[PDB]
Amino acid sequence: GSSGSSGMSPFLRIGLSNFDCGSCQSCQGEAVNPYCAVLVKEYVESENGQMYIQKKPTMYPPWDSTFDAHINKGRVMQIIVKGKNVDLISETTVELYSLAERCRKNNGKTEIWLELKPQGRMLMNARYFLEMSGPSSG
């Protein structure tokens, strides 16, 4: 209702749920305990051109839950599904900066369906939020 731009860094709250890895066999009852890796890079350009360095280490968000994300500028997010007896299940590209904008377009939060390749798919619900006090890039 009441907007305001005093000087706070807004953060994004993305939540992943209903992950489908294309079931093939339904004759077993074990827990692989898989986990997705959320890589966070930064936007930077050198004399060579444009590049992306992973300042933040690998992240491990919960399952079927929502996690908080830091917003700076041209930030990106990489979701890679990992597990056991496997080297790579799938991957997908996502924007941390642009996403923050898409949400607003939906008068709050926007619903996007990620497309993991070569196989796999999930729902990405990013919500808009505002902080009270955060760091400042000088």
Swiss-Prot record:
Highest taxon listed in the record's lineage: Eukaryota
Residues covered by the C2 domain: 8-114
Tissue expression as described in the entry: Expressed in skeletal muscle, T-cells, megakaryoblastic cells and platelets.
Residue(s) carrying Phosphotyrosine: 97
Location(s), subcellular: Cytoplasm; Cell membrane
Family: Belongs to the protein kinase superfamily. AGC Ser/Thr protein kinase family. PKC subfamily.
Comment field on protein domains: The C1 domain, containing the phorbol ester/DAG-type region 1 (C1A) and 2 (C1B), is the diacylglycerol sensor and the C2 domain is a non-calcium binding domain.
Summary of the function given for this chain in its UniProt record: Calcium-independent, phospholipid- and diacylglycerol (DAG)-dependent serine/threonine-protein kinase that mediates non-redundant functions in T-cell receptor (TCR) signaling, including T-cells activation, proliferation, differentiation and survival, by mediating activation of multiple transcription factors such as NF-kappa-B, JUN, NFATC1 and NFATC2. In TCR-CD3/CD28-co-stimulated T-cells, is required for the activation of NF-kappa-B and JUN, which in turn are essential for IL2 production, and participates in the calcium-dependent NFATC1 and NFATC2 transactivation.
Quaternary structure (record): Part of a lipid raft complex composed at least of BCL10, CARD11, MALT1 and IKBKB. Interacts with GLRX3 (via N-terminus). Interacts with ECT2. Interacts with CCDC88A/GIV; the interaction leads to phosphorylation of CCDC88A and inhibition of its guanine nucleotide exchange factor activity. Interacts with PRKCH upstream open reading frame 2; the interaction leads to inhibition of kinase activity. Interacts with CD28.
Name this polypeptide is given: Protein kinase C theta type
Organism: Homo sapiens (Human)
Residues of the whole record sequence present: 1 to 125 of 706
